[model samples]
Target: EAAVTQSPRNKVAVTGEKVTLSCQQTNNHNNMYWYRQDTGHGLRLIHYSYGAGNTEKGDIPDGYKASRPSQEQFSLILESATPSQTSVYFCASGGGGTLYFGAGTRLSVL
Candidate 1:
């Protein structure tokens, strides 16, 4: 079982509206990552951080943002949700090529 937890198992958002995804972990991991999963595309990295107060852009970062305010918490924000952004998102925390993932959040933008 993974130690990571995520909120809003499912979400519906309007286009151009702000959407936020929250994640938490009790594993005391130093590296955290946000990824989106889509059919045919597999998983695409969106953002990540080495630790609290640090964040970095990943392969696909446009229209998205990340925040790591503490060792146990990380968040992903969509400034303006779009139809293209509709997908299942996952939060993970770990290091050394190992990661514990959340159950995943399904988001739909209309």
Candidate 2:
């Protein structure tokens, strides 16, 4: 576990504009990751960094893009927002594998 902070709380962008949802965290664990919120398999490491500036890509499309910045941080980049791509970007870490948190967290789609 670490000091992880997600920003903006919420955002609004024009139909033709773009926005980025990001995360920042501490804890220099060797296994840093990027994950997205789906029903399951969300904590599966799509992209992970072990040591140093080496960068690699994954084939799963990640639903997720992870980086250590290696704050370690993660994010989803929304381009060409039309209120259709309006799914709330989510972040995940810890619970080791279950990637649990904030039972108080709730969001709506569409």
Candidate 3:
């Protein structure tokens, strides 16, 4: 089965605080992607990685950093959170085929 998991399904942080969203997968998928979903814009890629130790910046990577420490885990870090960053974050796994997504992490930066 598709194996992707995200932690802290909901979060609230003050502006300028650091926030982290974690993801883990067991499918041994080489590619991992992090995206944000807003009202107007659909899922916008923030960061991705082809494999362990290789994180790539996606369409919108500003204010965000990603890490792929191994074949099973990846993480997204927001150094200085802002209100604009408040949105629903999703972690996905897979590459050439269908992408499996996590339930999502709802973050609010006030």
Q: Pick the candidate with the highest TM-score.
A: 1
Q: Candidate 1 at residue 35, lDDT? A: 96
Q: Model 1, poorest ten-residue lDDT window?
A: 1-10
lDDT of 2 by residue, 10-30 (tens): 676777665566655554333
TM-score of 3: 0.94
- Candidate 1 lDDT over 1-110, as tens digits, reads 55999987899999999998998998889899999997985889999999989999999999899999999999999999999999999989997678888899999999
- Tens-digit per-residue lDDT, 1-110, candidate 3: 44788998999999999998999999888889999997985999999988999999999999999999999999999999999999999999996766989889999999
lDDT of each: 0.92, 0.45, 0.92
Q: What is the TM-score of each candidate against the true structure?
A: 0.95, 0.52, 0.94
Clashes of 3: 0
Stretches off by above 4 angstroms in model 1 are none
Q: Model 3 segments beyond 4 Å from truth? A: none
